[PDB]
Structures are given as C-alpha cells and as structure tokens.
Chains A and B, each alone.
Chain A
Amino acid sequence: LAPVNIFKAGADEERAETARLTSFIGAIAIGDLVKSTLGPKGMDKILLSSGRDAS
C-alpha cells in the first residue's frame, strides 16, 4: 500500500487476488441458496420480513 492516502474516510478498494475472491464467493452463494427449489421434487422456502411488519 502506498504511504499516501487517496481515498476519503470510509472508502475501500479491493484488487486482483481479493476482488476475484469476493465476486466468486457471492455468486456461488446465491446459486447454492436456490438449488433446493429446482426440478419436479424441489421444496419451498419461507420469507419473513423484519421491516415490512412481519409479512
């Protein structure tokens, strides 16, 4: 990391080894979440809300 700061407080940067790591973690996370609802014998999920008045 260069000793000089270029970003305001709260801003963050990620690069090659860390950037491709984060992007792949997110994608497979959403893919594995919904695989259970696929095909003629998939099951259903429950969605309950903390914000929208416990819908």
Chain B
Amino acid sequence: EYGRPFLIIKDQDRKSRLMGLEALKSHIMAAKAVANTMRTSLGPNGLDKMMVDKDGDVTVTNDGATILSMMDVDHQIAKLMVELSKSQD
C-alpha cells in the first residue's frame, strides 16, 4: 500500500537518470574522447582527417572547427565541445 506504483512523470519507465559522481565521471570520459581524436592534428607535423557527408561527399581538412562541425555526435557534452570550437573560430 505504501509504495504501490504511482505515476509522477509522463512515460516514467522510458526515462533514465544519473546522479552524483557517476554523472561527473561520465562527462569526463566523453570529453576526453573528443580531445584524443584531435590531439593528432596539432602542430606543423600534424595529420588530417577525411570527413564523409550524409550523402557521400568527401572532404579532407585540418581545421579544428570544421572537423567538429561535420562530425555527428549524440552525447550532450560532445555538443558542448563543438560549440566551444565554433565560438573561438
């Protein structure tokens, strides 16, 4: 009787949630992956990336902003690095 299933939020079953330190650690792992992908492209001896578009177009580039712009990401922290790159550009 005390804790029988009572609905508070629409679609309560389909939503996830992370609280506490496990929230902060997940952001750090997502942020590090973006930095390690683009560590290579720094300095005169750096290398490039070859982007591929939605339809099939090929673009080879070394600019920092463009790589993060043509990239498609899902993690919310990753989009925060993309917006950081554009603001500097």
Contacts and interface: CB of A to CB of B under 8 A. Distances in A.
Q: Do chains A and B touch in the complex (CB under 8 A)?
A: yes
Interface size class of A (residues with CB under 8 A): 10 to 19
A13 B71 CA distance: 10
Q: For chain A, what secondary structure do more than half of its interface residues adopt (helix, strand, loop), or is it mixed? A: loop
A2 B33 contact: yes
Contact of A8 (B32, B33, B37, B72): B72
Contacts, number: 27
A8 B73 CA distance: 6
Interface residues of B, number: 13
A3 B74 contact: no
A4 B29 contact: yes
Interface of A: 2-8, 11, 13, 23
